[PDB]
Each structure stands twice: as C-alpha cells, then as structure tokens.
Design an enzyme around this catalytic site. Sequence first.
Site, mmCIF file in Angstrom:
data_model
loop_
_atom_site.group_PDB
_atom_site.id
_atom_site.type_symbol
_atom_site.label_atom_id
_atom_site.label_comp_id
_atom_site.label_asym_id
_atom_site.label_seq_id
_atom_site.Cartn_x
_atom_site.Cartn_y
_atom_site.Cartn_z
ATOM 1 N N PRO A 1 -13.253 5.717 11.294
ATOM 2 C CA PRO A 1 -11.847 5.401 11.083
ATOM 3 C C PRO A 1 -10.980 5.599 12.347
ATOM 4 O O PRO A 1 -11.163 6.552 13.097
ATOM 5 C CB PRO A 1 -11.423 6.393 9.985
ATOM 6 C CG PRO A 1 -12.572 7.340 9.788
ATOM 7 C CD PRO A 1 -13.785 6.584 10.217
ATOM 8 N N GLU A 2 -10.056 4.677 12.573
ATOM 9 C CA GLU A 2 -9.088 4.772 13.672
ATOM 10 C C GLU A 2 -7.938 5.700 13.294
ATOM 11 O O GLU A 2 -7.803 6.068 12.143
ATOM 12 C CB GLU A 2 -8.524 3.380 14.002
ATOM 13 C CG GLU A 2 -9.576 2.321 14.345
ATOM 14 C CD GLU A 2 -10.394 2.670 15.584
ATOM 15 O OE1 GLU A 2 -11.439 2.012 15.780
ATOM 16 O OE2 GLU A 2 -10.015 3.599 16.346
#
Length: 252
Positions: A1-2
């Site tokens: 995930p960013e």
Amino acid sequence: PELPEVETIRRTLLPLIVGKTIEDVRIFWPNIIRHPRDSEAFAARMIGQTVRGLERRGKFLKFLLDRDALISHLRMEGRYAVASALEPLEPHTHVVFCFTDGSELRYRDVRKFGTMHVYAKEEADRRPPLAELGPEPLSPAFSPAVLAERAVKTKRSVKALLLDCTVVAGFGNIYVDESLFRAGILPGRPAASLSSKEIERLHEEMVATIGEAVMHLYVYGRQGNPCKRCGTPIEKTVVAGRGTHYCPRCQR
DNA sequence: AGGTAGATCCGGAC
DNA sequence: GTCCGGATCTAC
Ligand SMILES: [Zn+2]
C-alpha cells in the site's frame, strides 16, 4: 500500500482495535520480526498490553500500546484484518495478535516482505526504522526551502532524491513519477540542476498529488499509451534503480 | 567524514 | 532463471 492507503488503514483500523488487550501473539514467519531479534521475545513482551492508539509516519504504522510501540511496514502487498479467533486464517497469514475478546489482528502478505519492530514507546522515534525518517509530505516541515537544501548538496537525480526516505517520508515510486509529470520535470535531471522556480513547482505538485489521494494516473504504468495532456506516447526507462515513467514532451 | 552504490529480503509473473 | 518494489545495512 502507498501512503494514502496507509492513512486509510490507520483511520479504519483504530476503532477496531483500540482498548483491546493482547492475550497471545502467534508468529508463523519469524523473519518478519526485526526487533527484538528473537521473535519469542517479541511475542512475550506484547502479552498483556492494551492497544491505545495508532499513528502513521510515512508508510509506517505505529501501534501504541501500554509500554511499547509496534512499528509495522506492509511494503507492497501486506494487509491487516480484524476477525474472529473461531474462523480459519486467510492464506499467507504470518503474524496474529490475539485479543482477550476472542478477536485477532492478523497480518498477511503473499510476498512475505513486511517488517515489525517493537521498542519502548519513548525509544521508537530514535531507533530503526523511524530514526532519520524525513518530514511528512503534507506537513509544513516539508517546504520548498528544505527540498532545495537537499537538492543542491547531491549529485543524484531528482527522482533518486525524492525516493530518499530521509528527504520526505514514504513518497513511493508511483507518486514520484506522477508528481514529476505534473511539475514538468524529467526524472533523470540532476537534483542540483533544478531552478528555484522548478523546486517550488515540484513541491507544489508533490503536496497536491499526495493530498488529493489522501483526501487518475498520468504516467505510471502507461508506457506506450498517449499522454493525457499532449498525446505523446509515455516512455519507461530505469532511473534510480526503478521503473520510471514520463512524457518526453511535457517533462524537461 | 560521510555520500552514495550495492546487497539483501520475497515470490508471482514473464 | 530473471525481474522488482521499500528501506535498511554494508562497504566503496
Ligand atoms: Zn505529455
């Protein structure tokens, strides 16, 4: 995930675990645990502590307990879930925190690539992995002056600079390429070659790109396809050891 | 001295 | 068999 996704996880996970007390910690892949080095010590020290808060620094989640902070990085594919101890675990579950209420916080990752460090709360910020982490990209501590100071001192490309976690916390590959496209800056440019005007524009686009996401892609993954702004085919090369996407007309 | 490249971890996809 | 993200550790 960013980073924007980590912020969503932080916000949504908190109410599902706050005030719960750890009764057991089960570790199925000991290599995830980075501090204490012994995963048995890691499990033993968390037992009996209650979850008090959940913070984010870059892409790190900081679980705040009674005495300790658990610092977690999911990398690309790690995920947390809260579910019943009565139900079978999902595939690739590597660490489970069991609560006294029969619920569990489960960490899973097909890539088996994430990390966990536990320290006394007061130590967490001066130890790996949080020590040396640069300012939050959405904070006033990340300013054009700060970006300009780092840029002049280095021989590296502007992309390499932005990927440096000591420059700015948790700005991933995707957001670097998108921000450089929006700023009109080639990712292979030496960071020291940016004008004051370019540095200001880059800071602006960085904040806007992350900010919009926390609150849709121009270049990332779009090689061979027309630029959304000018129609020139997007190109991909390797810069700073990474897949790097840019429009050769819009960016210079 | 310290900046910076290289090695390292992992497995699904090519 | 090789590639590839992030971030840290090692060594030029
Ligand atoms: Zn273009």
